[PDB]
Amino acid sequence: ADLEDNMETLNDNLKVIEKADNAAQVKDALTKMAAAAADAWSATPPKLEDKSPDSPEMHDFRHGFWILIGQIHDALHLANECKVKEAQAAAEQLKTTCNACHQKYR
Amino acid sequence: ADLEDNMETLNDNLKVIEKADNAAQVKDALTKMAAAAADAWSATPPKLEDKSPDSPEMHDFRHGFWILIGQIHDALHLANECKVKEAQAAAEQLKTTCNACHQKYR
Amino acid sequence: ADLEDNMETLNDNLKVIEKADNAAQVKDALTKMAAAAADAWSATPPKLEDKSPDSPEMHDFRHGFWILIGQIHDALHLANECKVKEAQAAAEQLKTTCNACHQKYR
Amino acid sequence: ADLEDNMETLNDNLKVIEKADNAAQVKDALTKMAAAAADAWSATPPKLEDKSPDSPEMHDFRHGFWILIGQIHDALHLANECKVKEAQAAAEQLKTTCNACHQKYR
Numbered sequence: 001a002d003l004e005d006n007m008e009t010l011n012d013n014l015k016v017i018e019k020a021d022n023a024a025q026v027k028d029a030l031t032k033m034a035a036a037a038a039d040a041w042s043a044t045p046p047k048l049e050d051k052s053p054d055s056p057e058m059h060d061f062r063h064g065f066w067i068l069i070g071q072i073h074d075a076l077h078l079a080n081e082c083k084v085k086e087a088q089a090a091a092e093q094l095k096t097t098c099n100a101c102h103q104k105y106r
Numbered sequence: 107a108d109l110e111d112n113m114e115t116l117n118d119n120l121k122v123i124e125k126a127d128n129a130a131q132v133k134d135a136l137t138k139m140a141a142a143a144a145d146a147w148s149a150t151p152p153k154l155e156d157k158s159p160d161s162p163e164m165h166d167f168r169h170g171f172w173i174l175i176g177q178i179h180d181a182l183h184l185a186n187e188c189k190v191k192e193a194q195a196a197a198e199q200l201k202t203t204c205n206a207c208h209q210k211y212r
Numbered sequence: 213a214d215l216e217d218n219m220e221t222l223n224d225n226l227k228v229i230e231k232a233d234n235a236a237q238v239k240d241a242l243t244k245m246a247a248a249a250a251d252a253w254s255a256t257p258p259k260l261e262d263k264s265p266d267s268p269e270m271h272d273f274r275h276g277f278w279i280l281i282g283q284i285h286d287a288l289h290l291a292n293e294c295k296v297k298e299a300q301a302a303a304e305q306l307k308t309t310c311n312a313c314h315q316k317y318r
Numbered sequence: 319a320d321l322e323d324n325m326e327t328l329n330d331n332l333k334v335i336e337k338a339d340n341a342a343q344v345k346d347a348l349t350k351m352a353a354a355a356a357d358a359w360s361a362t363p364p365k366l367e368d369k370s371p372d373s374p375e376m377h378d379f380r381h382g383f384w385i386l387i388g389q390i391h392d393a394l395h396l397a398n399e400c401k402v403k404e405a406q407a408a409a410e411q412l413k414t415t416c417n418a419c420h421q422k423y424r
């Protein structure tokens with residue numbers, strides 16, 4: 001999907017996680033966020049529409065997505081361990097990464 | 107791109123790295139390998155054409171890709187620090203991941 | 213060194229990074245922070261004086277340190293690439309991990 | 319503990335894992351390996367007895383330990399998830415990191 005699409009999936013599922021009861025729900029939202037962050041990898045954000053896929057800026061843009069994926073990766077391990085609250089907190093702590101990218105590139 | 111496609115890109119660029127001279131070329135192959143692993147995320151491998159995108163087998167399939175992406179992520183940092191040999195050895199060490207997935211799922 | 217000791221080193225060096233000018237200084241503080249987090253691993257926090265080194269509470273306690281070590285690991289790659297600001301900021305985003313552990317275990 | 323000590327703990331527990339019948343056992347060996355790897359962080363290997371802690375060689379030495387720790391971290395999530403065989407295989411694939419460091423620095 002497109003960039004703004006993937007972002008919505010990220011945002012919608014964050015909320016699903018905030019409010020979830022049980023591990024199953026959390027696993028699911030995380031799985032969708034994971035796919036969304038992976039698909040987002042290829043994108044070019046408007047603010048650097050011109051630049052080439054080699055700018056220190058594209059390389060730094062894409063870096064924030066490795067961080068995100070690493071973190072979704074780990075949050076999900078917690079969910080598989082039935083550590084519902086610990087996973088929910090890992091999800092809350094992702095926002096730091098979301099915000100970090102947004103302040104630079106959005 | 108398709109899954110066999112992405113696998114070719116992975117395998118072609120591993121050779122490019124094996125034989126490369128200087129930092130710049132290594133960076134490039136890894137970058138291409140990164141994109142390929144990210145796209146490969148959403149894929150369903152023939153051996154699991156039946157199971158839904160939730161079976162412990164799909165979750166495990168995709169797990170192997172987080173491992174690889176993390177490892178490509180790190181080799182590329184090495185390439186940026188002008189440590190070329192270190193980066194090729196990280197590249198060679200990846201294979202341990204390639205092989206691991208292949209003998210479960212290929 | 214002791215737990216509170218290591219925490220001081222973590223906190224002191226965070227500030228050193230906040231205010232640093234150039235790559236070299238950032239590398240140093242992170243290096244010191246790395247060693248402090250690694251040494252912190254074996255520690256038992258007062259609040260879990262009650263639990264053996266196998267409680268889902270010690271394992272979770274130690275988990276927070278893997279997160280931090282990974283994050284120090286990555287900040288430092290940034291510093292080696294001379295990306296001073298990018299590093300300083302990775303450093304800022306760490307606090308999310310500090311805070312997360314403190315809220316649970318301090 | 320000392321460096322050769324930590325290496326024994328790593329090697330002994332690798333075996334314990336290769337042998338191990340049930341998940342509880344695997345968790346234990348990995349936990350011991352993680353502690354060992356963390357404590358090994360601060361060590362200076364004979365081959366680099368002279369060099370200051372700031373040589374690209376000490377930096378690279380310690381780097382191999384972050385890799386190791388990252389992989390022990392992950393293998394343990396597999397164990398908590400009751401996936402015994404997958405954890406065993408993550409453990410075997412660690413050897414790649416052991417060997418990599420030994421060929422350079424042992």
Ligand code: HEM
Pocket residue numbers: 003004007008010011014045046061062063064065068094095097098099101102105106
């Ligand atoms: C992390 C979990 C995360 C969230 C959540 C998130 C949300 C988000 C929203 C809701 C938008 C759009 C606002 C709107 O459409 O009105 C948005 C947009 C962008 N994001 Fe984002 N985002 C998260 C993560 C990240 C990360 C990690 C990056 C970079 C590494 C990133 C980047 C962007 C960009 C660029 C946009 C705007 C694109 C556009 O509008 O054309 N996001 N995000």
Ligand code: HEM
Pocket residue numbers: 109110113114116117120151152167168169170171174200201203204205207208211212
């Ligand atoms: C790691 C860098 C990596 C490489 C290299 C690689 C190569 C590769 C090749 C050459 C094929 C060829 C198929 C053919 O000739 O018919 C192939 C196919 C598959 N792969 Fe792969 N692969 C690497 C990594 C990984 C990882 C990390 C996974 C699992 C997450 C994985 C899986 C698969 C699967 C399944 C196939 C079968 C697809 C098919 O033949 O239709 N690979 N790969």
Ligand code: HEM
Pocket residue numbers: 215216219220222223226257258273274275276277280306307309310311313314317318
């Ligand atoms: C992250 C880099 C980080 C910082 C910074 C930090 C700071 C810190 C302070 C300032 C104290 C109080 C000491 C004093 O007043 O003299 C403190 C104490 C504890 N910490 Fe911490 N800490 C950081 C990281 C982490 C992480 C990642 C964890 C757990 C996984 C953690 C835990 C604790 C605990 C527990 C204490 C109190 C225990 C005690 O012996 O009093 N910290 N930290």
Ligand code: HEM
Pocket residue numbers: 321322325326328329332363364379380381382383386412413415416417419420423424
């Ligand atoms: C990975 C899990 C791993 C294992 C296993 C391992 C084992 C090991 C043994 C058995 C020895 C020999 C001990 C002796 O000299 O009596 C040994 C020695 C060294 N190792 Fe090791 N080691 C593993 C991992 C790693 C890693 C990741 C590094 C470096 C980053 C590393 C280093 C060393 C070094 C140096 C030695 C020699 C020290 C000495 O002989 O005094 N090991 N290891």
Ligand SMILES: *C1=CC(=O)N(CCN2C(=O)C=C(*)C2=O)C1=O
Pocket residue numbers: 129186187188189292293294295
């Ligand atoms: C790899 C080694 C190197 O020196 N360079 C250029 C120098 N440089 C840094 O050391 C940090 C940013 C930078 O440009 C490399 O690219």
Ligand SMILES: *C1=CC(=O)N(CCN2C(=O)C=C(*)C2=O)C1=O
Pocket residue numbers: 080081082398399400
């Ligand atoms: C997954 C979460 C949960 O609690 N259970 C039951 C017990 N169990 C584990 O927690 C890990 C392996 C195991 O059987 C789950 O299966």
Ligand SMILES: [Cu+2]
Pocket residue numbers: 001002039040
């Ligand atoms: Cu898309």
Ligand SMILES: [Cu+2]
Pocket residue numbers: 001002005
């Ligand atoms: Cu769309």
Ligand SMILES: [Cu+2]
Pocket residue numbers: 002004005
């Ligand atoms: Cu759209």
Ligand SMILES: [Cu+2]
Pocket residue numbers: 005
């Ligand atoms: Cu749309």
Ligand SMILES: [Cu+2]
Pocket residue numbers: 319320357358
């Ligand atoms: Cu020791």
Ligand SMILES: [Cu+2]
Pocket residue numbers: 319320323
């Ligand atoms: Cu001893």
Ligand SMILES: [Cu+2]
Pocket residue numbers: 320322323
């Ligand atoms: Cu001894």
Ligand SMILES: [Cu+2]
Pocket residue numbers: 322323
């Ligand atoms: Cu001894």
Ligand SMILES: [Zn+2]
Pocket residue numbers: 074077275278391395
């Ligand atoms: Zn974890």
Ligand SMILES: [Zn+2]
Pocket residue numbers: 180183285289381384
């Ligand atoms: Zn690294």
